[PDB]
Assembly symmetry: D2
Homo-oligomer: 481 residues x 4
């Protein structure tokens, strides 16, 4: 009935409309309190204790800030309170679909557990959102505050996942197209979701950031672009936009793809796979699901959080011994050892299906060196990481519209050459990391020899420490030295 104020360390005091409060105070939303934003990253950065819940509040907040700012600067847009609330709800609910340890679940576990299924947190979010609305009688409340549930639920889902299918959207018309650019921007990835996690992750990781998404909001405008009304940035902000993506890449390099964070994520995933058939999760009508099938039933999925990790760890079931033992090894910090990193060379890329064959490939290499131990495919992990600017090969800034101060209503396009010659020439790459399950000194030395030999055999890039870890092997390849 009245607004609530929430104090957030990143954003300070956030005002929440009563309808938003109703949505937040539900089991489906509060679930996000028990899911770590950075998953295994917490085990490397102790500051990163934050969960999806607080991130979601921030995203809803910033979504409101942006839509409000646009409305105040351009009354002609006819932005309504109903529009503002719908955008905030989408911002709040965009991460509802995340599973235990966030990206590990959708990124690592589900692809291995259920390769046939094509699943993402986005799809999960839409399903959970529907479940949230229907389970908690939210629709009546939406009507009370002027929302029209048929159109607006559609609109909210479309903001989260894109067209459920010309204008392909049904929730709002072309004149309100800019509303779809705020929470999850499918056009170029510039959205408030990134702005919140940049600031929040940095706050917790202990990586400094004085920058303003606030600045961006202040300079945002709506212009006509190809018969749609779209969000346009001021021209001079283009450098800041390139930097936003640079920041994202740096955060991935330093933190999200930290070699040990990833290995912990990998180990947890392995534990989950071993546990899958023995954990049972109760769904709608008392039906039982597995970790990998809870995504099919939202009532079951509601109860799938980071807790599962502890349920396995603390279990006594003999059937869970293999899974439990992996988790125990994580606790003792008996983790697999990082051997090295390389990149695929020139046009060659690694296909997703071929990830599985890779450990065998490394083991198959014959390094021209004496070896005390012989290592097996099963002793290796090979982690293939796709680093990009959020749009695969594409430059997202080529998909941004800008305006100039002398003609604020006229959208223009800006190419990379018009900005700096020091920008990336490519917007995607792969990293290949190799680890060894055998942690002893002799094994690790051997693993380094196999690894560097495999790099040479494949014409991959010379590992940075190649000359130190494998002095005998590196001479072989002339390109390297």
């Amino acid at each position: 009935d009245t607004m609530k104020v929430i104090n957030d360390p990143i954003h300070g005091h956030i005002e929440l409309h009563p309808l938003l409060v109703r949505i937040i105070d539900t089991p489906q939303f509060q679930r996000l309190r028990y899911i770590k934003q950075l998953g295994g990253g917490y085990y490397v950065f102790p500051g990163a204790s934050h969960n999806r819940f607080e991130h979601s509040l921030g995203v809803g907040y910033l979504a409101g800030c942006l839509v409000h700012a646009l409305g105040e600067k351009q009354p002609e847009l006819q932005i309504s309170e109903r529009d503002v609330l719908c955008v905030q709800i989408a911002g709040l609910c965009h991460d509802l679909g995340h599973g235990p340890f966030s990206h590990m679940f959708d990124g690592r576990f589900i692809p291995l557990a259920r390769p046939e299924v094509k699943w993402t947190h986005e799809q999960g979010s839409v399903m959970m959102f529907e479940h949230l609305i229907n389970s908690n009688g939210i629709k009546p409340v939406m009507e009370q505050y002027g929302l029209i549930p048929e159109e607006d639920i559609c609109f909210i889902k479309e903001q989260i996942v894109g067209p459920l299918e010309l204008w392909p959207y049904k929730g709002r018309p072309e004149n309100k197209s800019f509303l779809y650019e705020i929470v999850s921007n499918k056009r170029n990835g510039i959205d408030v979701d990134k702005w919140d996690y940049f600031a929040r992750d940095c706050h917790h990781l202990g990586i400094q950031n004085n920058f303003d998404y606030k600045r961006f909001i202040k300079f945002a405008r709506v212009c006509e672009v190809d018969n749609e009304l779209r969000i346009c940035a001021r021209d001079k902000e283009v450098g800041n936009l390139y930097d936003m993506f640079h920041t994202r890449n740096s955060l991935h390099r330093r933190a999200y793809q930290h070699k040990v964070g990833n290995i912990i994520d990998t180990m947890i995933t392995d534990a989950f796979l071993k546990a899958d058939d023995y954990i049972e999760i109760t769904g709608a009508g008392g039906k039982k699901y597995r970790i990998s099938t809870a995504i099919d039933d939202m009532e079951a999925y509601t109860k799938l959080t980071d807790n599962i990790f502890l349920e396995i760890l603390y279990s006594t079931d003999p059937k869970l011994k293999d899974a439990r033992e992996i988790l125990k090894q994580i606790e003792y910090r008996n983790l697999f050892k990082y051997v090295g990193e390389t990149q695929p060379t020139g046009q060659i890329k690694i296909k997703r299906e071929d990830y599985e064959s890779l450990p065998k490939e490394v083991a198959s290499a014959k390094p021209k060196v004496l070896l005390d131990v012989k290592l097996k495919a099963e002793d290796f992990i090979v982690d293939v990481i796709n680093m990009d600017y959020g749009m695969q090969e594409k430059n997202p800034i080529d998909h941004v519209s800008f305006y100039c101060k002398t003609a604020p209503n006229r959208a223009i396009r800006i190419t990379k050459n018009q900005v700096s010659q020091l920008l990336p020439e490519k917007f995607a790459e792969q990293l290949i990391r190799v680890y060894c399950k055998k942690v002893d000194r002799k094994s690790l030395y051997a693993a380094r020899q196999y690894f560097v030999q495999w790099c040479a055999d494949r014409n991959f890039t010379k590992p940075q420490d190649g000359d130190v870890i494998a002095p005998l092997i590196t001479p072989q390849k002339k390109e390297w030295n």
Copy 2:
């Protein structure tokens, strides 16, 4: 093989000796990852997602910083690497004994589940530390790095809990070492310094104490034939401010009325669940939530998870407990009625009779509903400077730049006339389990009447919530 570096948002890059790493990488220590620093506070301050684990690293770090600084400034102290490691270990392990949602467990749940016992997180920490050492073969590792486990385990425990010269782990010449992690003399320790900075970072609030500066100006002097840590004289204002900051954090955050009520509701749920949750201990034995403190192997598995285990349960026996937790999720909380203070110095002894007392008041007003003792919660909160009635600064030793080895004492008048005249008080909060508008209105009338009957302070909103009752008391108006 060698040191590890950990990046902390509060302290930046912390170097950890390999022995410390071995201790950290154990189930008993890593458990702290799953216990929230501020418990129910997270449900009011979404920034407060931090756990005991990160706080513990910070405390170990600052313990090392202080002992190192003292050694570098005063080589004569003969501080040893062995001493430094023992102080760090105590700093790291001082919070090992905490249970689910931290202070709620030792502060609220255990006193109700096991009223006969005096139990504290300190005692828990000593027991867990012993379990950690013995379960993970740490003693051999300690010897490898020059520690003497018999003496040093004793020393570490004594730093955490105090005497088991009453100390056996170190002699009087090394007395100052016992002032660093948990200072029983005046409460000025590195544990406070970390949580001030860490809680503030996460809460989104401002901290008055500058701990780095304090460390830089710390020295050891002879005081009554002990070597004790002394602060530079000009830092006295900063020390008063440290305690002010602590009090403000309690007022704004740790004792936030809704955080406390959520803690209370969780405690109630735990009590209802107690007999039906079973926690597996050493040798496969089963314990209860309230008895896991007896077996460290069981206690190791007692973390915030328990909350979710109850919440996600389907056992009919757990329905009552589960329903309370579900109400928390729907934000269907017990309602805050009001807050008052007992009058001047007079203070309230330990509590169960209080709800009945409020219900017994007969407010001279029209009431649609009549409320019962069981409908009320009364929460009594002791706010002080850490030493009951006493001023801890009267128990600090200082030095002047013109005579750095000469300890002096400084009284409150020598500092400021704007300081507190008192160092302890109580807050009394009343809540109602009946959440309907008519019940809440009635609860307000009982509450304000009870305040008037007892001569307690006028609630701030007394004139608004109970316009008919407030005229009765002349003092108030």
Copy 3:
């Protein structure tokens, strides 16, 4: 004119209305770039390089934030764009009257140079504001944007200095709350404090996560004694006490830092010696002195921190005495701090008159001493400003209530003012300093002042004399 955005490290991006930009882009306002916020404090805290200019932008910004927030939450107040602009202008211009090194000028120099005159930066700000308006043709611009200069200039001045019975003419009682925002004469809770807390902390290197933002969010207007006044939410009372605690702590640690004050004192002495020999050109080419530039705003416009360097870099023999003091500051050959106690021109003589029962190699004279009396209070002399705050409760947000100290905490101060008395010595010799300590502690004992913290160390012979001290 158009709207401009300014990036501020404390507040981030501040939007400025074109009328505000016009006011800012004038010699009278830009002058504030050349006046340090903390004066001599920069010579102790190297981070405190900030000037009055950036502080002024922040105050104007926060004034706008508060008035806007009140208007959005309570449309019934009938707050107008004209009102918002006037409040912002007052916030921007409230520190226009500051002189070189800020408080030193109004706090130390003017009282000594011109004891007969009663002058404050507030009065200076009003005069400069008038000069700014009249010199730069701002009144026509104000009209263009809907302001009514006769009423609104009056209103702006009143916000800065107070009344020139509702005693205000610029706005009526219904808009009384507007006078509480920039410079709150009722209880001191204003946006000026909120900016300098955050800004000074940022530069000093003293941490502050807290929010004035929170305060703004919980501010409301209620009827109080037939005026509309700003009321805080009841639960914020603890935070308000803490605001004043913060202020006191900043004064103790930084603004009244014993060496910052002594540098301010030395600079003041140098200014006094230089006064007649520096000439500052005013309106009509007339010449003024440092101490008389306050009479002519055209002259005052050219009176900034630069004067310090003009003196320091001078070669005029007449300025040698002044120049030498400044040179001593550079060499860090400072007047020496002797000590501090707790209970103005006559004081140095009084200390010198004390006869300490100790052997002294040197005899010191009144002129060798500086006595600095510092009033540490909660901004309202003896009074508790929180007793002059109105609050509201969530169950009746339009109903103002009063909260007394006992309703809050028994751990709060019993007193809201004190004095610190610091004594320094000009001479700086070891023997002189030792003597100064003996005179000082003896004077403390003679007057029944508090025992200096280091009294037993600096004056072991004297301290036994006084029984209370022990």
Copy 4:
């Protein structure tokens, strides 16, 4: 005794008494009156900071790094004497800066005294010598174990490089202590503590975000043998952070140090100084009088050349300075030369570019015709500090498995998303005529000149010069 100074960036800095003696001198304290970012303060009101506080930070970080190396590698035989010398160089590296910093050495001196070859580095060495000699520091250095002959040489070399073909061109320390020259001012690859302080300090004051974590870098720094020298090596995994450091530097230049209006204010101040030059007199050694442009010849005069000069001119009663004073007054009214636009070359002294723009004949009607003198053309070199070169190719690294073995890492071994180029230019054009008709004309000349030269299409080209932009087919 030691003194402690509280710094907002670094917290509490401990200063050895010898350092305090050096700091408490007119030559050092002068830095309090010189803005770090010059005209930048007139765009970013947060940037009030001066060279003085930056210098303390640099001296502090220099001490942190040399101390850390000594503690990790006792074999280096780092001495207290070495630590103090490194700190003194760090403290004194910016002594030579003039009013508004880079504006003085970058803009004013090149125009006032084109024949002279002058830099702030050279100034710093001269001022340092003046500081030492004027304040009797050498005796104090000896008292604390310094050897002035060798150590003064060492300090100067750290600041300006060899005073001189040789594997060792330095005289102040031998090859075994080579790593000491990499700390304050790194001529090999530019990775030094001077950048680390100004990144953090400028960001603090500007209200922007800094990518480089210098404390981490220090923690992972080591010394290894490289080509018969002992050099500072970074841990291999820090290479990404190093690339980011340079990215941060470039971003700071783009957003702040080369802000179009900050630069124009710097240009206007420089113009004012040029007009004032002959009329301001600055007293030097023996009471001799110098000009703003000649104070660099006498350190006693240079000591008194600070930002104050700006205010002296602005507040001058004296008529003689009316043209100079008027320019400064225009700055105060914000009556600035107008930015017309920015472009980039394909490719890459002073008088010629404005003339070129004016010479273009745009196929458009023009109310006014503009002259070379009405234009300013500002050419800005954006690079990674080493002209065309990649500085990371000049860094040595080590791996955890062999911490004493230095290796080299090439760009392809890091990321394919790194820059392909390490240098570019920006060309900005401004107009001294500020009226609407003049500005419109200036835009037409500018865009025409861009088209004529095949420079990049200005971002707002289609808006400011709709008629010209069609002509160029490339411009899509």
